[PDB]
Design a protein around this ligand. Structure first.
Ligand code: HEM
Length: 291
């Protein structure tokens, strides 16, 4: 099963920077969402979930086909809440109808990370919509109530190693768990709409207690009002993960560089890029453009 990137006809860097900018401008404008967290975190999560269905063994799932637009995937219990990100992107897609669904969903994630002051994430165009029967079944996204061995094995299916897993998980600095979506409640820290290495700092520095939430699920809580999922906390229970958590807690730049690599890889898993494909694009932020 081969998915060849095909550039939207006649489009180039400038066209995608316009789409970036529209997303970024709406991120700034629609600031009220989720008690003023804004849409950044949910857009990052959407980009991850549309990519995280990939299976390296047979190249099913993955961002290429844009299949989140079909009800089977839209309604995956694992994706509860992401409809808010999709709705955000609707007017963007209406303005730029030429962009593929997979390019739009993944570009939303890149735009959110950069506009939240995260690392630059190189991004490649050319995902092509595929039909409804290519939508992957529910159940390929990870459970949160599990341990380090679960996490490690899970991410092998996405061809991610320990360092890539721990780097990717730093995105959990962003946003919050919502009890009605996932059966977990609370943010992971104070800086949850700016992209930093706070996830690692808080894992190491907060005093965590294993409590039950109102949905009768266990989660790790701090007196400062933060929470970690069991799978988050597993990163400091496993000795190999813990070393890498300490590394990123002590080196912001290294976290940024490793996140950027792992996130681009996640977003590109399953896609074959022709040798004569354009190079990856690095979009300017609104701030860099004076916009
Ligand atoms: C073991 C892997 C992971 C598990 C079990 C997991 C689980 C969760 C769960 C349960 C939530 C809360 C959803 C809700 O209640 O609204 C969440 C939120 C989120 N996740 Fe993860 N996740 C994992 C990996 C990742 C990765 C790799 C990324 C992206 C690089 C990511 C990005 C996010 C973001 C940004 C949020 C906040 C969303 C919001 O505030 O609306 N997650 N995740």
């Amino acid at each position: 099963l081969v998915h060849v990137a095909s550039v939207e006809k006649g489009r180039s860097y400038e066209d995608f920077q316009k789409v970036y900018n529209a997303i970024a401008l709406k991120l700034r404008e629609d600031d009220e969402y989720d008690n003023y967290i804004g849409y950044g975190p949910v857009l990052v999560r959407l980009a991850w979930h549309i990519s995280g269905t990939w299976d390296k063994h047979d190249n099913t799932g993955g961002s290429y086909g844009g299949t989140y637009r079909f009800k089977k995937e839209f309604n995956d219990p694992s994706n509860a809440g992401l409809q808010n990100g999709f709705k955000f992107l609707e007017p963007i897609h209406k303005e730029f109808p030429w962009i593929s669904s997979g390019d739009l969903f993944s570009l939303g994630g890149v735009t959110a990370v950069q506009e939240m002051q995260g690392p630059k994430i190189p991004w490649r165009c050319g995902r092509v919509d595929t039909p409804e029967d290519t939508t992957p079944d529910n159940g390929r996204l990870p459970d949160a109530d599990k341990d380090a061995g679960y996490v490690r094995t899970f991410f092998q299916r996405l061809n991610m190693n320990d360092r890539e897993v721990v780097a990717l998980m730093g995105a959990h600095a962003l946003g919050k768990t919502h009890l009605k979506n996932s059966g977990y409640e609370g943010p992971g820290g104070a800086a949850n709409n700016v992209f930093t290495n706070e996830f690692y700092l808080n894992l190491l520095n907060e005093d965590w207690k294993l409590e039950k939430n109102d949905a009768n699920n266990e989660q790790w809580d701090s007196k400062s009002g933060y929470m970690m999922l069991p799978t988050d906390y597993s990163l400091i229970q496993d000795p190999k993960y813990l070393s890498i958590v300490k590394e990123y807690a002590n080196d912001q730049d290294k976290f940024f560089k490793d996140f950027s690599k792992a996130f681009e890889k996640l977003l590109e898993n399953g896609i074959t890029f022709p040798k004569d494909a354009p190079s990856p694009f690095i979009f300017k932020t609104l701030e860099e453009q004076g916009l």
